[PDB]
Each structure stands twice: as C-alpha cells, then as structure tokens.
Amino acid sequence: GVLKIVKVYLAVKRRIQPGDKMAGRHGNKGVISKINPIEDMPYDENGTP
Amino acid sequence: VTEFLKPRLVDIEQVSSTHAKVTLEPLERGFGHTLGNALRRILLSSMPGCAVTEVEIDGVLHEYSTKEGVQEDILEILLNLKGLAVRVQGKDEVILTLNKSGIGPVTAADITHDGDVEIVKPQHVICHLTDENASISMRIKVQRGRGYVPASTRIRPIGRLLVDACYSPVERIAYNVEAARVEQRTDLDKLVIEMETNGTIDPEEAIRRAATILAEQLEAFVDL
C-alpha cells in the first residue's frame, strides 16, 4: 500500500529551563526553580560565586 | 561634620596581564561596603564587550557534520571560538578571515588581523589540522554587545552558523575595605577592587564606566 517513504532527521539543542529535573547521585532529586543573574549569587571573600 | 571627603583613584596596579587592582581613597565610614557592592554589581552586570556572533565555514552546511582533515568536529570549533578575546577600536561590527593549510594547531595568531582589530591572547587554540594538504578557511563575525544573548532569541543562507554571545569582559570581582592613614584621622577607610577580566577591557575605563552609569541612572531621584 505504500509507494514511497521519506524520513527527515531534526537536531535540537534543549538548553535548560525552570522546570527541568536534575539530581545528584544520592537520591536528592529536585526541580530547578530559577536562573539568577550571577551578581545575586552568594560569593565567598575570594570573589568566586 | 555635615561634610564628606570625596574619593579618588590613587593607583591602578597591574599585577598581571588580566589581573588588576584599583585603590579608592579616602572613604567615610559606612561607604566602603556601599560603594564596593554597588560597583561590584554594576561591573559584573553590564560592561560593553566584543564577541563572535556568526561563523561561516567554507565547506560545511550545518554544525553537526564533520570536516575531513580537522581533528575536532564543528561543534568543538564553535565552542573554542566562543571564548575568543578581541577588541575593536571604531567599528561596531567587523569580519575577520582565517585561512590555514598544513599540519599543526591553528592558533588565533593565524587570523589575518586588520589594522584596528586586536587579539589579546595569540596562543589561544582553535583546532588541529592533521594532514599536509587539509585546509580550513572561515569568515568570523565579531559584534559589540552588552551582556548575554542566546542564539534563539535574536530576531540567512544555509552556510551560516550561529554561536551564542557572551559580551562581558569581567569574570570575577572582589573587594576589601581597610583603614588607611590620612594625615590624622580615625575611622577613615580605603577600598581595594580586585578585578580579573579576560583582557579586553582597561581597568580604569571599566571603573569610570560603572561610576558614570550608576550616577546618571541615579539622577532620576533628584528633582523627582
């Protein structure tokens, strides 16, 4: 019943959003919740946030 | 009382190529932290930088393919290119050209630099050609921007590849308040801003830029 089939491959780059689910190795899963700008993150006295 | 010493720039010590220190003095009590924090947020937030935006390789249609002769894929070439450091004097949008043939690494120094565009780290690597007669020719596009701009959210032929922009010279900013010694006074501070840029921005220019932006945006409160 089929005469010809055409297949197309799409490549996508899923980047990251508030809502993804990243987890550690000790079963401490969690849903990422915000993407803060770097100037708001805690930073130690050396300057590395 | 009811009068405040005004700060000043005492010395811009250049400890290394990309690591710098700025000293501000004098400062009344309670301003050390205020100015330190304001300037840190401003500097990390918005400094005008320059970065590569579009690449156009000769014999490649999309970034997921491979080219015969080069060692890495095209994705790793784009990634390595994304971290390129370059300054442009007058033009807000320039086009560099790279041509290479022969075995070896392809440093940024092989870019056919124009008069005004300046590469800051001529030992940065891009790819490894592994054949005596394998060549690469590409046309890099460099723009001037003010932050982060992902490829998706901006706004033709099938030969253009789009990389994400990261226009920000500064990378890490720290600071310290410490008592100084004016002719005679107690509780007189001195601010030290430690800066680690990627080499494309002059320190004093950056600090003056932050000061002017903060002031001229604070102007909206006076005569409200």
Tokens of A9: 């491959």
Task: For residues B52 and B182, give the distance between their C-alpha atoms in angstroms, rounded to a whole number.
Answer: 47
Name the token pair of B33: 């932290």
B109: DSSP letter: G
Q: Which residue has the tokens 């008069």?
A: B115
Q: Which of A37, A39, A47 sits opposite B194 (nearest CB)?
A: A47
Q: How was this structure determined?
A: cryo-EM
Q: How far apart are CA B206 and CA B49, in angstroms?
A: 11
Q: Resolution of this PDB entry, in A?
A: 3.5
- Residues of B with Cβ-Cβ distance to A39 under 8 angstroms: 40-41, 44-45
Q: Determine the Cα–Cα distance for residues B68 and B86; give it in Å rounded to an integer.
A: 29
Residues near B123 by Cβ (< 8 Å), separated by ≥ 6?
Answer: B107, B108, B109
| Nearest residue in B to A49, CA atom | B172
Cβ(B124)–Cβ(B52) below 8 Å: no
Contacts of B214 (CB under 8 A, 6+ apart): B38, B39, B42
Query: Residue B96: enclosing H or E segment and its boundaries?
Result: strand B93-101
Instruction: Name the helix (H) or strand (E) containing B38.
Output: helix B32-45
* Short-list B67, B69, B63, B93, CA closest to B81: B63
Cβ count near B192 (within 10 Å): 17
Give the integer Cα–Cα distance in Å for B80 and B127.
8
